[PDB]
Each structure stands twice: as structure tokens, then as C-alpha cells.
Write a protein that binds this ligand. Structure first.
Ligand SMILES: [Zn+2]
Length: 195
């Protein structure tokens, strides 16, 4: 978007994003906020209204006290991988927590972008009343839910296809155009949702 809208959304994010105590790459943390600032301001203002916080983490997720209960827990589908929640860089839903530096695909996660995927979960659940489970989205998901790949994950859980599609829509113009070409109904759905 234009530089002015980005600055306005960053001002909104200043009352949403919470930075960690420990040491971390300040420039990369700022880059994560810049990418979050591409999300439509209506969604950001709604997260602010519900007092949702986006906690950026300087270390492992499970080294935060509020998530210490996840230490040693094996995520769904990760059995036999030798990996646990200790290795998970982000989560989204009723809360959002994101490890600084793990934005890009493959940094311990399969999303096109960590912060947009997880924040999409929170928007889905807190702002949009679990719209990813709506009848309208289910029909779209049945047709297009496999077209971003990861067929046995994104294609099985509409909440994950929604979050990944949301991330594609708002990350950059390239992922936005790829979404329109691969998932035209999902693209139009997200386009109207922001109107
Ligand atoms: Zn997810």
C-alpha cells in the first residue's frame, strides 16, 4: 500500500505489538511490524479494540512463562519428527506470539510468512467469529483449499487455508497475484471481506 496508509497502520500496531525483554534484532522486529502494517486497517483496529496483543519473542516459544506449559509437547502431526512446541516459532488464535527472525517460510514453519499467518488466525477467531468455519468459506475451501499446496494440511483444515490465504493476500503483490490466479473465489472473498 501507499506509504501513508502504512504509517497509519504502524501507529495502530504500536498499541498491539509487544516487544520482548531479552535481546533481539531490532531491525528485523521492525520489519515484522512493517509486514503486519500491510493488513487492512479495519482488521488491525478491530484487534486493538479487543485488546489482542501480538507478542514478539526473543527466544523459544516455550521459554515464555505463559507458554511454558507447552514444553516437551508434541504438536499434532509432528510425531516421530523429534520436534516439539519448543521448536514452533509462532501461534495464533486467542493470542499471538511470534519468534523474531522466523518470518520466512521454512524457519520452523510452513507458512509463506509467520506473522501474517498467525495474525490471520487471531483475526479469524477474534474479529470474524471463526469465519473460516462458515458455510460460505467451507464451499470455497472444498473447491480451492488445496491450491496453495500442503494438501494434507491446508487442504484438510479450513482454518489453516484461511490463515495461509490471508497471508498471501496481504504479504506483497506477488503473493497477492498468485492467490488470485490459484484461488480466485478465495481472493474475491477476502477482497469483499475488507470492503
Ligand atoms: Zn496455522
Amino acid at each position: 500500500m501507499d506509504s501513508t496508509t502504512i504509517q497509519q497502520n504502524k501507529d495502530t500496531l504500536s498499541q498491539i505489538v509487544v516487544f520482548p525483554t531479552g535481546n533481539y534484532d531490532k531491525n528485523e522486529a521492525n520489519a515484522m511490524v512493517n509486514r503486519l502494517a500491510n493488513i487492512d486497517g479495519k482488521y488491525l483496529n478491530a484487534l486493538k479494540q479487543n485488546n489482542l496483543k501480538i507478542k514478539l519473542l526473543s527466544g523459544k516459544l516455550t521459554d515464555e512463562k505463559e507458554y511454558a506449559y507447552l514444553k516437551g509437547v508434541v504438536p499434532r502431526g509432528w510425531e516421530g519428527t523429534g520436534k516439539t512446541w519448543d521448536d514452533v516459532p509462532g501461534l495464533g488464535g486467542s493470542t499471538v506470539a511470534l519468534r523474531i527472525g522466523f518470518s520466512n517460510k521454512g524457519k520452523g514453519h510452513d507458512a509463506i510468512n509467520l506473522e501474517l499467518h498467525e495474525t490471520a488466525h487471531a483475526i479469524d477467531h477474534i474479529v470474524l467469529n471463526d469465519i473460516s468455519k462458515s458455510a460460505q468459506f467451507k464451499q470455497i475451501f472444498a473447491k480451492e483449499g488445496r491450491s496453495l499446496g500442503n494438501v494434507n494440511y491446508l487442504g484438510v483444515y479450513p482454518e489453516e487455508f484461511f490463515a495461509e490465504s490471508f497471508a498471501y493476500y496481504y504479504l506483497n503483490q506477488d503473493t497477492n497475484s498468485k492467490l488470485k490466479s490459484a484461488c480466485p473465489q478465495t481472493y474475491s472473498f477476502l477482497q469483499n471481506l475488507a470492503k
